[PDB]
Design a protein around this ligand. Sequence first.
Ligand SMILES: [Mg+2]
Ligand SMILES: [Zn+2]
Ligand SMILES: [Zn+2]
Ligand SMILES: [Zn+2]
Lengths: 477, 40, 44, 89, 49, 48, 192, 115, 240, 257, 64, 98
Amino acid sequence: RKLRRQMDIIVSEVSMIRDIREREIRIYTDAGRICRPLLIVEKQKLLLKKRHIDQLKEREYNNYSWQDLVASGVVEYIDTLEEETVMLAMTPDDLQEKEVAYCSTYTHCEIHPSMILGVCASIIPFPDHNQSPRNTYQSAMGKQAMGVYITNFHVRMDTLAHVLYYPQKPLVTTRSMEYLRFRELPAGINSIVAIASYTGYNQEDSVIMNRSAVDRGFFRSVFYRSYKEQESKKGFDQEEVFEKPTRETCQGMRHAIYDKLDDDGLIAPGVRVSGDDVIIGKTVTLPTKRDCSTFLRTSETGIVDQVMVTLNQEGYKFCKIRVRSVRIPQIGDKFASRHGQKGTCGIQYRQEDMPFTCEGITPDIIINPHAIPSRMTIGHLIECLQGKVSANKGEIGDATPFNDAVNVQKISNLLSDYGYHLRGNEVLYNGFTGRKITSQIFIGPTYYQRLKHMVDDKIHSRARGPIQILNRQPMEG
Amino acid sequence: KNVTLGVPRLKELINISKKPKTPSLTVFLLGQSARDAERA
Amino acid sequence: MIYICGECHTENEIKSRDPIRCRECGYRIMYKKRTKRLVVFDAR
Amino acid sequence: EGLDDLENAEQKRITTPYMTKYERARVLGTRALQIAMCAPVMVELEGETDPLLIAMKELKARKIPIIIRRYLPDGSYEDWGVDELIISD
Amino acid sequence: RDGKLAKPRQLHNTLWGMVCPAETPEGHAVGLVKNLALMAYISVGSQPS
Amino acid sequence: LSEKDVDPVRTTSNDIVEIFTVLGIEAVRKALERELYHVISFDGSYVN
Amino acid sequence: TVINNWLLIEGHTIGIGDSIADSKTYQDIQNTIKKAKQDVIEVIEKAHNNELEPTPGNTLRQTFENQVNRILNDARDKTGSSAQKSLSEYNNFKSMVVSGAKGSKINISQVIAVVGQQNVEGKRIPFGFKHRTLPHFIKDDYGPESRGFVENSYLAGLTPTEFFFHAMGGREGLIDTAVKTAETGYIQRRLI
Amino acid sequence: MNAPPAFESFLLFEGEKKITINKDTKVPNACLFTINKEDHTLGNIIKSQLLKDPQVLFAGYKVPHPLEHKIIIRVQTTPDYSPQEAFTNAITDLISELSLLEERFRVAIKDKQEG
Amino acid sequence: SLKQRLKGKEGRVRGNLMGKRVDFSARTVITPDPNLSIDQVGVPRSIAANMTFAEIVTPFNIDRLQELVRRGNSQYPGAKYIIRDNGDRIDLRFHPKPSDLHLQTGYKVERHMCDGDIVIFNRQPTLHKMSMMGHRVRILPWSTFRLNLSVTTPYNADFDGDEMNLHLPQSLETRAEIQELAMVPRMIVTPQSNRPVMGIVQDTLTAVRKFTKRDVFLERGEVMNLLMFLSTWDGKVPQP
Amino acid sequence: PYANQPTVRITELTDENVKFIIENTDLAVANSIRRVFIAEVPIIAIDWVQIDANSSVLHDEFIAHRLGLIPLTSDDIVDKLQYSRDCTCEEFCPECSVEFTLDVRCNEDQTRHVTSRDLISNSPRVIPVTSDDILIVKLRKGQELRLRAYAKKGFGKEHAKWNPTAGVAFEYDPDNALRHTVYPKPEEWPKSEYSELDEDESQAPYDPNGKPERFYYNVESCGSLRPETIVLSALSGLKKKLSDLQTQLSHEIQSDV
Amino acid sequence: MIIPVRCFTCGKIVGNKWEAYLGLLQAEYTEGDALDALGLKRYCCRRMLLAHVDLIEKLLNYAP
Amino acid sequence: FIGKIPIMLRSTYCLLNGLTDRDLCELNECPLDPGGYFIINGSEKVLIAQEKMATNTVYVFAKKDSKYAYTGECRSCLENSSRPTSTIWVSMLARGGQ
Ligand SMILES: [Mg+2]
Ligand SMILES: [Zn+2]
Ligand SMILES: [Zn+2]
Ligand SMILES: [Zn+2]
């Protein structure tokens, strides 16, 4: 252990396991062993001192870093095998306290208990306040949400890419988000969510959206679809080439207009396209020349964003056409609350139709109250509460799990100083009649995510369409 | 003690195979053993 | 038929027969110039 | 699904006088198709254009000119006029 | 063949701090697909000499 | 069932194969229904 | 149509205020949990002293676990019923539970009072580590917190160990859901 | 694709009448006023003005569907009063109230600006 | 080989006979609609204009069908094709000249799906009778299918992104068969358990509990508003 | 049986918002008034854009969206400007719309912030409210944004860009004397700025004979219209809608009788 | 990418306050004090600037 | 020359190694991009870590269905060499045989 902590002859990833009851000492130096760093504890005291923290604060222009902690023997990597022999204190503030005396031989301490979470799970606020299946479901929703997938999304020509117009950093963040770069590349918008049974259109996990907010760009996004095509001379009898088919060039052509294509057979950027339009004009010589143009789908409606021409790995003429389609939130689009409450937009009500507070604030999204009791997503309620204080206090709330400094009572106390009901409730007025609602509605800023599942991407219809000539049965046209 | 119930028991009733997961009997007593734990 | 070199962003005219290679930079990634047609966007 | 399946390692009529729901469905559908095919309507219809609604009016009036041949399991059959059966609605 | 002897889908106690307890896919893949914890590191290996 | 002091009328088994060879197809018909009803009614559900 | 339009006047919601309970209720919950731990500790001491006699048809381990599980179950039931009784008529959780629209009595108690004991395969959290549930406990720790008794509610927030044990207990629900969803259709397509 | 034009919420299409009156056969002196391309703004204000009339036995409005742009107002009056008269009177009352409200608001602005 | 075409899940019997793709069907995400009846399904205008129903030309509808013919595919509702007595199909979008499109009794006009059309709506997995119920079409201006909250119970549907299958019967025989056998009202009670398969749920269930409380009082203006939504109301206001 | 006798008391009047009280009015009238402020007050906003060149990192229809949201000076011109549907012209013209033009080219190492100041209109009456300036897309050296747009009359019911209000606070019965809302614990609710209750008081005594009256409003304007103009335009607009309905209703009655 | 022109919830102009807000932060004003100085009274308007991420500043780091 | 090895982006052998954020931007690459993937025919391919039992370690198991009462296996693999792993099973036959 001493040599490992000093890194003299044993590297930090080597694990030494002694089976005291079995007179066995196993030293594992092989690859693929999962391990994690744990602070070393000696004589019920942490080896980490303020001097190390000060040197870690002065990280810049000083070159002091994590490697200096390992070399100092303050922290070491413990693997799943060695953990059996390790007596791990959850926190130095209470687990190694002589007053508790639960164990007097702690060997290590957790740096922060929240580091057991993954990437998607670290995006959940107050996960310790949510039911475990909802944290699992959010981990999937976080991967299906919309935001900015990468900074160079304008240069990249990915086959499918959804970029949110106005992504925002969450008003209630988890400390891990600073390391996940969720602040620089957010995937959602802080929405004023009201939990109310407003005319029943939000029933059964449905959501009601403010049409005036959507008109202002709320959750608006741009969908980029990249189409790739190349011309290959494989087989001397066939020679495909990009060029717009012409009556004299091709023996047979449809009445569809090819005027969108340029003399090079490629559509130009800034041109509107639909299932009736051709993005690439390709023709192959027959063993006259037939046309093998690339048409868009009937659902594809957008504008040509960029068209590149290059020579691919095969050396053949290759081109990629990126079509831009703007997806405005509409009935049926799926949304997620960052706490596993996934739901489709049921209806959109304008600002005058939505219920309003005494200050004239109308919720951006209204969710059904029955979604919370069965799911027990109290972390959502606490996030909605912490977000209301955050927006008023002008500070990004910290929702890191297992943190004793933040609790519902402290959040309620702060909210009381901003002139709001300590539990987040507000007296809402019905937008249709102006009468106060008898029950006070829980409303506040909650981080919502738009999922890639748009209704326009799934709606389809079939009525006497193309059939297979051999099987005489339905097939996609 | 545990007994097979639910979907796997319903599966055994439709899949009547020679070896069930929890073959068992429900034995009833006639005389004093019905009312006396010692005789039972 | 004008293409923009992806590296030097210089407008060059290219035919069907000549290669995609940039006239001066030699870069082989070219982007078609935006259409001259009028495209109307409703501010909604 | 297989791992869980095996778990190896880890006059003289005997039929009822009431018209069945199935008979009513087919009778109405068949009569509606006939009406849509310009067949004469056995009931005086006023302001009606849907052949299916017209067939329902004929059924309520018991004027549908259709006979149901109910096949018995022994191969025999019973011919019951729609006007003879009791309508379940 | 190995996974047939013991079900690997359950969240084993040894996953503490090594694998995310919540982050797993729904359906046929529950507990088969896992994600490393933020501080989880995997040994690169070196000569035992 | 042959043992003394053991009720030969009410004593039964959950193994439908045993009921078939010991009591017969009609006993199975009643036994299968009782076992099928128990699994359905165990959680309080009901089927006609 | 009639009631959904009346619901615009009355309104319905759910929020933090419904999860809150009186300080008296929290004290009753804390006292009940404290009593349950002491009772479990006494059962543990009796087993360690060989003063616990196995029940007929059960071994000592089964008898010990049965006694410990019933104590923790009674504590959850007592804490839950105490919380449910303390709720006001205005409490929106009660309004939905009473109507039967969604949620249940257990949900109220888990949100407000006590989440309770977490089970894997119908038994307490197994010793995945030899003689231990996690590296934070002592070996042979049969205590409630060690074996996965979550004394905190979702409002109070689970401790680090309780969170992993609740993820272990919830994984079984995710697996069983996937299994039931896949093999239920099979029984019907065969019956037919 | 299916999104309706935003102007359809307030513009009448070719051959669409702003208001159509249907007599309610269920009760005498009852009529159903269906107003196209209108919403709660006119439905609620007219309903309240009708309720203030003592000769109006019933006055209520509803939107058949929030995605549609129609409001149906049912009005029942006493045997000596006709619903069409109550509806016209209610509208004149609102026009009068708003006219007086405009004049008083203009005066209030001048008073606030002057002192 | 020949035998290879017969064997397997994709073979003739299992892949082309016991199950197969069907025309006149559409699928999209379902969304709630408390304003539609339990037996009514809201359909996108694009789906309704794409799907068609073949109506036989009769003197009762000759004028109505001739109008739909001249409206054609460009204007909804319209029609896609005309089938003459000879059985030949004519596309209306190719030549909408009325001189050539005059109808006569016996013709068949493939008009677009419209309000009141009977359709079979299904959600998979199809585990029982109530998983495929007959519904009346209602055109709505958005790409989603609308379902009443009550019918979500038999379909086991939840509006978290679920999709459902809509099938349109192509003849009066099947259309009447659905009307008389599979419509949602006839499916209210299930023979499986001698009880209603669908009930009041969520907002309506929590609100009815509150609404039925002894201390809930409604003013004249409130009562008259609620009575507008009571289609079964006899028009007489009860004594308060 | 007839119209109410409403009275107005203005509490605040600035260039940003107007606060006023309306008394002796029905809740439906008071509510319909606030609804008109949001959805029925006409203003002039960009609704059509032609982008000749756009080298910025934001796509053409995203730039067009930002331009639509920009408020334009339309206090007096909106009254005389016609709707494109109502005007007798063929297309966009001064009688139904205002032309806007923007042409910004960056050739400096310093990033060029395109703002509402860069928008030049053909009519001095219709100009961006800011002419700090509203931020539009930022151009790097060699990037440019060149476009022309048309602003036309419309109201918030069509699109939120035509809504002249930046928030319409509306309140009535601040003391809850009508008990339209029932607090579980009145001591937990903060007092309304319009409330007239003492420090120890929590709610006014229930008034079974009371009815909603003395409506409190705070109309904040985006800048397109002065806050007082919004209310005057709304009241006259609401009156117009009712007068139009009365006219069509009269013709219907006259046709049936 | 860039600051919203209108506040989603109420429609208040915030598209002209971003550079002002950054100026206040540079002047040592707290995030709350900066929002108050700009007059963003409603928490919905504060949410706009407090949660905004001006990614256009990073996108401008790439050549045209 | 013997061939070409696909390079993991931002690895010590990648061109985007040690480059400052400005250099990555000049190369049209995102500074925040974590790398750790391969570009194969233009498609970003990520290698999912495969979980398997540890080699060179004795594990004793019991199989209820097998004839063996207990079995001690060892998946022996040579030190960073001879990738084909050979497994030896030392099994104890059951006592219940007739
Ligand atoms: Mg669903
Ligand atoms: Zn170049
Ligand atoms: Zn014009
Ligand atoms: Zn705002």
